[PDB]
Design an enzyme around this catalytic site. Structure first.
Site, PDB file in Angstrom:
ATOM      1  N   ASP A 118       0.817  -1.215   0.000  1.00 54.74           N
ATOM      2  CA  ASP A 118       0.000   0.000   0.000  1.00 54.74           C
ATOM      3  C   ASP A 118       0.851   1.265   0.000  1.00 54.74           C
ATOM      4  O   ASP A 118       0.469   2.276  -0.609  1.00 54.74           O
ATOM      5  CB  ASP A 118      -0.942   0.011   1.206  1.00 54.74           C
ATOM      6  CG  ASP A 118      -1.985  -1.089   1.143  1.00 54.74           C
ATOM      7  OD1 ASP A 118      -2.190  -1.679   0.057  1.00 54.74           O
ATOM      8  OD2 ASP A 118      -2.600  -1.370   2.193  1.00 54.74           O
ATOM      9  N   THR A 172     -13.867   1.406   7.586  1.00 54.43           N
ATOM     10  CA  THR A 172     -14.740   0.611   8.426  1.00 54.43           C
ATOM     11  C   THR A 172     -15.792  -0.097   7.582  1.00 54.43           C
ATOM     12  O   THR A 172     -16.122   0.321   6.468  1.00 54.43           O
ATOM     13  CB  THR A 172     -15.446   1.475   9.473  1.00 54.43           C
ATOM     14  OG1 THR A 172     -16.522   2.200   8.862  1.00 54.43           O
ATOM     15  CG2 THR A 172     -14.479   2.441  10.137  1.00 54.43           C
ATOM     16  N   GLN A 217     -18.794   0.011   8.010  1.00 51.77           N
ATOM     17  CA  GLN A 217     -19.912   0.902   7.736  1.00 51.77           C
ATOM     18  C   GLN A 217     -19.653   1.675   6.447  1.00 51.77           C
ATOM     19  O   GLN A 217     -20.521   1.743   5.566  1.00 51.77           O
ATOM     20  CB  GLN A 217     -20.136   1.843   8.917  1.00 51.77           C
ATOM     21  CG  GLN A 217     -20.768   1.178  10.137  1.00 51.77           C
ATOM     22  CD  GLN A 217     -19.876   0.125  10.784  1.00 51.77           C
ATOM     23  OE1 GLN A 217     -20.322  -0.989  11.063  1.00 51.77           O
ATOM     24  NE2 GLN A 217     -18.604   0.464  11.006  1.00 51.77           N
ATOM     25  N   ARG A 248     -24.017   2.107  -2.652  1.00 51.57           N
ATOM     26  CA  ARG A 248     -24.063   3.209  -3.643  1.00 51.57           C
ATOM     27  C   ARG A 248     -23.748   2.667  -5.035  1.00 51.57           C
ATOM     28  O   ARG A 248     -24.434   3.038  -5.962  1.00 51.57           O
ATOM     29  CB  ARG A 248     -23.174   4.373  -3.222  1.00 51.57           C
ATOM     30  CG  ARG A 248     -23.777   5.216  -2.115  1.00 51.57           C
ATOM     31  CD  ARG A 248     -23.028   6.507  -1.886  1.00 51.57           C
ATOM     32  NE  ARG A 248     -22.713   6.597  -0.472  1.00 51.57           N
ATOM     33  CZ  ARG A 248     -21.997   7.554   0.098  1.00 51.57           C
ATOM     34  NH1 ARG A 248     -21.528   8.554  -0.629  1.00 51.57           N
ATOM     35  NH2 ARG A 248     -21.767   7.521   1.401  1.00 51.57           N
TER      36      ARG A 248
HETATM   37  C1  LIG Z   1      -4.200  -0.113  13.499  1.00 52.30           C
HETATM   38  C2  LIG Z   1      -4.572   0.773  12.321  1.00 52.30           C
HETATM   39  C3  LIG Z   1      -3.830   0.780  11.124  1.00 52.30           C
HETATM   40  C4  LIG Z   1      -4.228   1.605  10.047  1.00 52.30           C
HETATM   41  N1  LIG Z   1      -3.367   1.838   9.012  1.00 52.30           N
HETATM   42  C5  LIG Z   1      -3.479   2.860   8.216  1.00 52.30           C
HETATM   43  C6  LIG Z   1      -2.321   3.374   7.545  1.00 52.30           C
HETATM   44  O1  LIG Z   1      -1.267   2.680   7.446  1.00 52.30           O
HETATM   45  N2  LIG Z   1      -2.385   4.613   6.911  1.00 52.30           N
HETATM   46  C7  LIG Z   1      -3.526   5.389   6.985  1.00 52.30           C
HETATM   47  O2  LIG Z   1      -3.558   6.507   6.404  1.00 52.30           O
HETATM   48  N3  LIG Z   1      -4.617   4.943   7.730  1.00 52.30           N
HETATM   49  C8  LIG Z   1      -4.573   3.708   8.375  1.00 52.30           C
HETATM   50  N4  LIG Z   1      -5.684   3.271   9.134  1.00 52.30           N
HETATM   51  C9  LIG Z   1      -6.826   4.192   9.236  1.00 52.30           C
HETATM   52  C10 LIG Z   1      -8.148   3.469   9.258  1.00 52.30           C
HETATM   53  O3  LIG Z   1      -8.489   3.026   8.053  1.00 52.30           O
HETATM   54  C11 LIG Z   1      -9.257   4.240  10.045  1.00 52.30           C
HETATM   55  O4  LIG Z   1      -9.266   4.139  11.370  1.00 52.30           O
HETATM   56  C12 LIG Z   1     -10.596   4.210   9.376  1.00 52.30           C
HETATM   57  O5  LIG Z   1     -10.382   4.717   8.043  1.00 52.30           O
HETATM   58  C13 LIG Z   1     -11.662   4.957  10.198  1.00 52.30           C
HETATM   59  O6  LIG Z   1     -11.199   6.173  10.808  1.00 52.30           O
HETATM   60  P1  LIG Z   1     -11.540   6.484  12.363  1.00 52.30           P
HETATM   61  O7  LIG Z   1     -10.862   5.386  13.166  1.00 52.30           O
HETATM   62  O8  LIG Z   1     -11.262   7.902  12.753  1.00 52.30           O
HETATM   63  O9  LIG Z   1     -13.110   6.131  12.543  1.00 52.30           O
HETATM   64  P2  LIG Z   1     -14.279   7.238  12.448  1.00 52.30           P
HETATM   65  O10 LIG Z   1     -14.307   7.792  11.045  1.00 52.30           O
HETATM   66  O11 LIG Z   1     -14.240   8.179  13.636  1.00 52.30           O
HETATM   67  O12 LIG Z   1     -15.566   6.306  12.641  1.00 52.30           O
HETATM   68  C14 LIG Z   1     -16.199   6.106  13.912  1.00 52.30           C
HETATM   69  C15 LIG Z   1     -17.408   5.210  13.696  1.00 52.30           C
HETATM   70  O13 LIG Z   1     -18.380   5.926  12.933  1.00 52.30           O
HETATM   71  C16 LIG Z   1     -18.688   5.234  11.726  1.00 52.30           C
HETATM   72  N5  LIG Z   1     -18.865   6.197  10.618  1.00 52.30           N
HETATM   73  C17 LIG Z   1     -18.000   7.169  10.269  1.00 52.30           C
HETATM   74  N6  LIG Z   1     -18.472   7.851   9.202  1.00 52.30           N
HETATM   75  C18 LIG Z   1     -19.652   7.303   8.859  1.00 52.30           C
HETATM   76  C19 LIG Z   1     -20.670   7.552   7.823  1.00 52.30           C
HETATM   77  N7  LIG Z   1     -20.495   8.561   6.928  1.00 52.30           N
HETATM   78  N8  LIG Z   1     -21.762   6.753   7.816  1.00 52.30           N
HETATM   79  C20 LIG Z   1     -21.927   5.761   8.707  1.00 52.30           C
HETATM   80  N9  LIG Z   1     -21.039   5.474   9.677  1.00 52.30           N
HETATM   81  C21 LIG Z   1     -19.910   6.208   9.795  1.00 52.30           C
HETATM   82  C22 LIG Z   1     -17.527   4.293  11.463  1.00 52.30           C
HETATM   83  O14 LIG Z   1     -17.925   3.099  10.778  1.00 52.30           O
HETATM   84  C23 LIG Z   1     -17.081   3.983  12.876  1.00 52.30           C
HETATM   85  O15 LIG Z   1     -17.922   2.941  13.349  1.00 52.30           O
HETATM   86  C24 LIG Z   1      -5.363   2.420  10.190  1.00 52.30           C
HETATM   87  C25 LIG Z   1      -6.093   2.434  11.383  1.00 52.30           C
HETATM   88  C26 LIG Z   1      -5.692   1.599  12.433  1.00 52.30           C
HETATM   89  C27 LIG Z   1      -6.563   1.655  13.700  1.00 52.30           C
END
Ligand SMILES: Cc1cc2nc3c(=O)[nH]c(=O)nc-3n(C[C@H](O)[C@H](O)[C@H](O)COP(=O)(O)OP(=O)(O)OC[C@H]3O[C@@H](n4cnc5c(N)ncnc54)[C@H](O)[C@@H]3O)c2cc1C
Ligand SMILES: Cc1cc2nc3c(=O)[nH]c(=O)nc-3n(C[C@H](O)[C@H](O)[C@H](O)COP(=O)(O)OP(=O)(O)OC[C@H]3O[C@@H](n4cnc5c(N)ncnc54)[C@H](O)[C@@H]3O)c2cc1C
Ligand SMILES: Cc1cc2nc3c(=O)[nH]c(=O)nc-3n(C[C@H](O)[C@H](O)[C@H](O)COP(=O)(O)OP(=O)(O)OC[C@H]3O[C@@H](n4cnc5c(N)ncnc54)[C@H](O)[C@@H]3O)c2cc1C
Ligand SMILES: Cc1cc2nc3c(=O)[nH]c(=O)nc-3n(C[C@H](O)[C@H](O)[C@H](O)COP(=O)(O)OP(=O)(O)OC[C@H]3O[C@@H](n4cnc5c(N)ncnc54)[C@H](O)[C@@H]3O)c2cc1C
Lengths: 379, 379, 379, 379
Positions: free
Chosen positions: A90, A364, A366, A374
């Site tokens: 990636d 996620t 979701q 969509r």
């Molecule tokens: C261990 C780990 C490794 C990862 N590695 C990478 C990496 O290497 N590089 C990188 O850039 N990112 C990385 N990711 C990022 C990862 O993909 C995110 O955590 C994910 O994209 C969601 O962001 P968030 O945790 O802030 O959740 P949030 O966006 O805060 O979501 C919170 C909750 O709300 C829900 N939600 C949010 N928006 C909506 C919507 N519009 N409709 C319905 N439900 C919704 C979500 O499903 C979730 O249940 C990593 C994350 C982790 C934890």
């Protein structure tokens, strides 16, 4: 589906390596939160560290399907070791797909052959998880350089990567047309490392905060034209989801394998519990869900290799179902082992802990259900 | 359901103690795998350590419903601290319910008032989990003593208990009519401690192997008549299941509380995610399942207090549903927190790890579904 | 929960009537799509047709909990007969709760005692299902009368009701503050009946299109002040949901009862299938879900009787869970009967068909999950 | 997976016929409980009635995969019309696979070309559903004939079949080695027809009781050697399950198609409901489950064509998952249409009724989970 003899020999080597080298190391990798250095060094010597690096840059250039098959085999014995390959690929994809010929030669050549250098992809921020357009990192052009200010979190291998792809607004008012992607090298002044945050599972993996404090990167390091960063990120996401689906298939299969073996060995009520109708039922549901997940994932990976536009839909379906399946199957695999399944020495509890991440990362479940719905409702 | 003013004041004190004292300690208790000594000492001073010890022996003698309400409050903030009370009560119940007047005076008096002494129940063996009748520990009468040989595993507080109730065959050929129960004191020669096995969750709790090597206990230590041990064990199980249901309700509620708070604070796409229809849907399903579980558990606990025979059926229903609910709700509560939910500092991942045990201990959910179905089909 | 001796005797009579009179008629009521006239006439003679009609107007004025207990008993043997009581009560509630003293005397007195007259509630339109604010029926005041133009669909007992409560915009621009509710009598000129639409289940029930063609109702027929209609509708909805939850509990219980009986009688593999571990498991899950649903529904019904504001939350939880439970349990009850469960003569297939409606009417389970989640997230 | 150009043209014709001819007839076929005579006559003229009849006997001899693809297309628009092909093929398979060269020529030639004659398979009895070894029909050899006494139930097309394969004990003491299979012709003296029993769904199909009253069939009509009947039945079951999986995939897809179309057309809250995040989520889960089911079924059908032994395992997985998916997706497709989904004119309620049978016939999903689990645990 007809695998080439190069694909078949590669996967026979991967299965042998997973069994003999990766699996005996998985418990300690989790228990002690170790970077899988031995696996990284071995994968480099075998040509498995950079599967999607093109042959033009000294790479093996296997397809997406081959990598997906490799991730299933590694996910079966160590999810953290599978995550190394996912993060490494990636971190490289934005350059492979959007970089100019000059940029690709300048930054991909160092990954040729048996190179052990690492990549990373830095998009997510504390303010921008699913809402990637809310990212606040900014890139300002100043003469022959861009000045990068901001931060990133949850960056896999962030603090150990030699090359990081960093997404940043160059025009904060154009939203999805105002983001750019930049090559960032280890050692750049103004690149600062934060915490390696402690996780429920996937503990054999580095999880980095990054900070950019007036970080100067040369203007040649932009990947594509200004404002194309968001589309570049979206194109890699379809591929990342398939890799996470394949890893989740592997996790689910590995937990099922242990549960299957236990039912054959564990005797209660005078005979092995595999003779019990309800245990048989749980194993049936587990395996059915694993195989369905495997078929979806393999289909999506082939669509990606074919450059088919329907890969987005089927990749999102595979990611959702494979990761939900890993969560459910690992939860039930711990159940099948009874009390022993709750004990750390027996592995399945770690696989349950590992499985939960696949429902969250690369988007996620979701967010992915929305990508799937969509695409179906607004084709 | 009309709680006495003693019940209401007790639970107001428990909620205050859970919030101010137990909750701030939960992360370290798990991280460092500590016995909850502070909680044990405080519960002893407040009269909360031995809720079901009868007033005749210096105890508070609250009902099953009161303890179930207490376990819900403690399970909300620390499942390991709730398990202390469950183990302590379960270790005492065989004596309270089957012991002669002399045996109860001799061994229950030491738990009066603010005593900090601990109990344990030792039934499970490596060869005998759900199939308890396959236990191999043997008790042989020799003059004025029984000689105990065998072993036990998964014994909560086993290695720190002052009094252990040990189940053993006195007539190995009579099966369910050939088991007896014995009081075993800390310090008895021939009582040997094994590993404290390392677990996925409930880490703030001791999980002991026990070995009996020609262990001599006086003949007065038998609980009831020879051959009544299995019925004694079965009678305590109905109560243990309700306590595990109540703990699981608490775990589920505590995880929901954190997820609910996060949806109100976590802003994505311009407003708190609580404004998002799918987040609202997950929280609705979580809370509905928690409340259903709570109602079942409270009903079963009242049937036990009333000595009603239908407590077995409703206790088995509550145990199955409460623990499945804790597993599903904690799994989704981690989901609601996104990446942050996978981080150890935020608590819900531990609650997910804690929740898995409630589907296994006091009888797996496969065994309980059989208890429920048999009671319905063969009334 | 302590039922009065009037509640207990009423429900003993209802159980006897359900068993001896309602149940033997259920198959023909469905097969021939009959209005339950016999049940209606008998309920009128026993004082069961208008349970919530106040004593001031010659009614029995039982609580919401008593009606909910009655609906469970009728839902067990005939969902269509339970729907008669639900429709009859719902058609009356807007007048009971929002009508002036003069309006209540003028229109509720005709339902006193053993009256067999029918009511209906007319809110839903083809353009306005979940989006009730999109309803297009209009009420224009002209001197001493309102002129009603528009249409309604899915109106239970619409074409046979003596009194219909009709919701209509009096100020189409004020949205939720621009709707009014009106008493409409059978025989009013300009009231026209459409199709009785043919349904999957609940076939022993009338399902009416209504049309209003310059329908003149006297100005005294408005229920409350102009613009209060939407709040009046919302207040009745909380009650309707509990009634639909109770009916769904009954359906689920009735299907479980038949499946339970079949496992005891149906012999395969040398003994009754109730001896089979997986059949035992299905029955356990069915009964657990029925009892959970019953406890939620009874709690919500008591909160309504107490005028507690939390009835909205718990009524929405009970409605969602009870109706999902009826769908799942009836689906599995057909499964438990094998091929015979698919045959119309054996009843459970009809209960499965009946059960699907409870997930839709009085608000779909998608709408209710939003009511539950919003109440939890925005308290 | 590479379909031949004969497979592709056949399925293009089937899709055209399903859309233009079968679908407009489906509502009346169900409403009036009609045998699909028009479809039968058309399929005969197009070479679609007897897909698996070998070319040696004038048949088209398409593979199992081709038929499975055809059943998916027909199941999408009319489950009863798909059941005709399933029953017709299943009635023929015992002869095709176990019949001597003489028996196959004598009874299969009449199905050559555009023949409209019908087959049936008669194994199930009131005393023998899942426990097939409890069947009580007996075959006694008397000179040059077998005398058949007994009965069968749930026999699809039983009363209209020209050739019925009847399973009967020739040695009631040898159990699974004491059953034989016999060709039985329409018009044989002693063959008596019972009720065509009325069903929840699949109403466009005949469901027959059969009675054998000293029925004399010539000794040449035995299929294989005496005592081989049970193995013959078991070999056809693997194929029947795949056909039922494919029909269930079609049902699920057809219901999804209608729900997808409704979300695009049905406007609530100012825009089509397809714009609503929860509707998008339901459609995503539905489609993911349909595609997973389709992939499993297509894999099992290819394993059968390849004579691979693992077809039993994957056919049982596909049957379980496809039919559970049809039940869940049709249940949710009715939900997506709201009130209109409960109306008979809109088709999806019938598809829900049709879907429930696929969880029962060709072996209940409880029996199939055992086939899957035993194959995995005892390989
Ligand atoms: C261990 C780990 C490794 C990862 N590695 C990478 C990496 O290497 N590089 C990188 O850039 N990112 C990385 N990711 C990022 C990862 O993909 C995110 O955590 C994910 O994209 C969601 O962001 P968030 O945790 O802030 O959740 P949030 O966006 O805060 O979501 C919170 C909750 O709300 C829900 N939600 C949010 N928006 C909506 C919507 N519009 N409709 C319905 N439900 C919704 C979500 O499903 C979730 O249940 C990593 C994350 C982790 C934890
Ligand atoms: C952390 C912990 C604390 C505990 N505390 C106590 C304690 O303090 N004292 C004490 O005596 N015990 C204690 N228990 C014991 C506990 O209740 C058991 O683990 C449980 O009773 C099952 O035993 P087992 O783990 O050997 O599972 P097994 O019996 O080996 O079960 C393995 C799997 O097979 C299934 N299975 C088994 N039999 C059947 C059947 N007949 N039908 C269908 N499925 C079946 C089970 O559901 C399970 O999925 C504890 C256990 C643990 C892990
Ligand atoms: C047999 C029957 C009897 C009934 N009786 C009465 C009666 O006596 N009087 C009366 O006035 N009404 C009655 N109802 C009306 C009934 O309650 C409605 O059908 C229901 O309120 C939904 O309306 P709809 O069918 O148009 O579904 P729609 O609103 O079109 O919904 C279609 C689908 O979209 C979903 N959806 C809609 N909006 C949203 C949203 N904002 N978010 C997420 N998902 C959404 C729904 O859950 C559903 O799955 C009855 C209906 C029927 C079918
Ligand atoms: C409409 C229809 C068409 C059919 N067509 C044909 C046909 O053309 N020819 C033909 O010969 N047959 C046909 N079948 C037969 C069909 O496959 C059976 O109904 C099925 O095999 C089960 O038999 P049963 O209905 O008696 O269920 P039962 O065997 O009585 O099962 C009752 C319940 O117990 C469960 N159960 C039974 N045994 C076990 C076990 N050992 N472990 C766990 N659970 C168990 C089942 O899953 C089911 O839930 C048809 C049936 C129907 C209804």
């Amino acid at each position: 589906k007809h695998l080439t003899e190069e694909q078949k020999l590669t996967l026979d080597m991967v299965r042998d390596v997973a069994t003999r080298e990766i699996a005996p190391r998985a418990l300690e990798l989790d228990e002690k939160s170790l970077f899988p250095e031995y696996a990284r060094d071995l994968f480099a010597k075998l040509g498995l560290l950079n599967p999607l690096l093109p042959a033009a840059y000294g790479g093996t250039e296997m397809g997406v399907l081959t990598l997906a098959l490799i991730l299933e085999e590694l996910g079966r014995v160590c999810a953290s070791t599978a995550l190394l390959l996912i993060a490494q690929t990636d971190g490289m994809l934005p350059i492979i797909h959007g970089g100019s010929p000059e940029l690709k030669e300048r930054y991909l050549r160092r990954f040729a052959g048996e190179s052990t250098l690492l990549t990373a992809l830095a998009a997510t921020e504390p303010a921008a998880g699913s809402d990637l357009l809310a990212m606040k990192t900014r890139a300002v052009r100043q003469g022959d350089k861009y000045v990068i200010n901001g931060q990133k979190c949850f960056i896999t291998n962030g603090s150990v990567a030699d090359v990081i792809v960093v997404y940043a607004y160059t025009d904060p008012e154009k939203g999805s047309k105002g983001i750019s992607a930049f090559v960032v090298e280890k050692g750049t002044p103004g690149l600062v490392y934060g915490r390696n945050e402690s996780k429920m599972g996937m503990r054999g993996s580095i999880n980095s905060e990054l900070f950019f404090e007036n970080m100067e990167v040369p203007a040649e390091n932009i990947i594509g034209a200004e404002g194309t960063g968001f589309a570049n990120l979206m194109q890699t996401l379809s591929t990342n989801r398939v890799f996470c689906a394949a890893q989740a298939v592997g996790i689910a299969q590995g937990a099922l394998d242990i549960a299957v073996r236990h039912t054959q060995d564990r005797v209660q009520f005078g005979k092995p519990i595999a003779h019990l109708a309800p245990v048989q039922f749980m194993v049936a549901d587990m395996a059915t869900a694993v195989e369905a997940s495997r078929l979806l994932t393999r289909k999506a990976a082939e669509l990606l290799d074919d450059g088919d536009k329907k890969a987005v839909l089927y990749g999102s379906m595979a990611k959702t179902m494979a990761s939900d399946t890993a969560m459910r199957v690992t939860t039930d695999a711990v159940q099948v082992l009874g009390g022993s399944g709750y004990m750390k020495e027996n592995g399945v509890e770690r696989m349950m802990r590992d499985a939960k991440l696949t429902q969250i990362y690369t988007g996620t479940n979701q967010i992915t259900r929305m990508v799937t719905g969509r695409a179906l409702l607004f084709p």
